[PDB]
Design a protein around this ligand. Structure first.
Ligand SMILES: C[C@@H]1C[C@H]1c1ccc(CCC(=O)N2CCC(C(N)=O)CC2)o1
Ligand SMILES: C[C@@H]1C[C@H]1c1ccc(CCC(=O)N2CCC(C(N)=O)CC2)o1
Lengths: 192, 192
């Protein structure tokens, strides 16, 4: 495990400077202080190394959202949504290189695409359930189907966070993204 | 030009069945009824063929939005936004294979990334100007900075349209996407 961790830390550090294309199995072995065949004992490929890194990041966010769901903030509905979106902003924003490369690999990799898909379905379902609960309590109006509204809003966040972290043009500055997403969540969830 | 058009039509037809990776210069020449070296006279690579296809699609949408801007519908503010979003839905939705592959190539191709960036900046700027005009006339409240609000909403549409057209999981069904986006535009633009 200590050497497995080494390989993962090396991959994360290198992904800060280059894409996964420009990183070889030899670069990973070298940084982890192991040989090439020893690398292949822990991981079958550099793609599997990414997949593991991405799995850790996605579970960290998922576990943080579970924690929030169990310990609701004693706060207004705007800060409720802000606290939830902030899980993603801080989690992925603390692992931008992994996040970016994990998104790029969605195009090439079946398991990476499936990992993203699974967790997106889960977070969408949760969002939809909160919206439904808000509607049942009379705080939000019955406008769009909750699960479609949840899907769009979650996709917005994915795209917008990714663009901000990558400093794409165009993008919302990183110091304005949370406010910008929360406004659009709150107005569209509560707006008649 | 007739042979250039042939190559483009062949590329568009093939991209319906495979990604650009699985299409070779030989497949393109073959479908256009030309030789391989004759192909290289018209285009330097299969990437340039995509780039041309994508440029045509993006300009078609841009010209449609210009047309709308010059001939405003005599309609309420909700149908105003719907008519604009619908330009993208119908334009890109009529060229899904090109649209999808053009998005995939953003990761690999500098010119493709720049083409998308240019036009996104333009459509964001336009959106922001309409929002500002709506605020000046007192129809919309001064909430978020207009250009940040415009950026998020345009990124939402990009991601959501792409997912819908690709039938990703998760996605908004294609027959519900326009309604879903328009709701979120209108509530967030006009919602206090
Ligand atoms: C960067 C990573 C893919 C993108 C992403 C997915 C989901 C999000 C933010 C939205 C999110 O999932 N929420 C928002 C917070 C909400 C809550 N009440 O706790 C429900 C869960 O960002
Ligand atoms: C599929 C293609 C990238 C994604 C995209 C970009 C922009 C959009 C839809 C939003 C758009 O640009 N609008 C929405 C309509 C609006 C108007 N008042 O005319 C301003 C322009 O979708």
């Amino acid at each position: 495990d200590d050497r497995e961790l080494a390989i993962l830390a090396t991959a994360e550090n290198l992904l800060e400077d280059r894409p996964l294309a420009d990183i070889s199995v030899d670069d990973l072995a070298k940084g982890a202080g192991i040989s090439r065949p020893t690398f292949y004992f822990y991981f079958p490929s550099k793609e599997a190394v990414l997949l593991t890194l991405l799995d850790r990041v996605v579970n960290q966010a998922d576990m943080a959202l579970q924690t929030l769901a169990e310990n609701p903030a004693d706060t207004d509905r705007e800060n409720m949504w802000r606290t939830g979106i902030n899980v993603f902003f801080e989690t992925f924003g603390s692992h931008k290189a992994v996040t970016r490369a994990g998104q790029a690999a969605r195009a090439t990799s079946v398991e990476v695409a499936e990992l993203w898909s699974t967790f997106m379905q889960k977070w969408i379902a949760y969002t939809a359930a909160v919206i439904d609960a808000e509607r049942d309590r009379g705080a939000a109006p019955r406008t769009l189907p909750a699960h479609e509204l949840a899907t769009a809003l979650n996709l917005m966040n994915e795209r917008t966070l990714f663009a901000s972290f990558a400093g794409e043009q165009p993008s919302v500055p990183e110091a304005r993204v949370l406010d910008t997403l929360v406004h659009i969540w709150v107005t569209s969830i509560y707006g008649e």
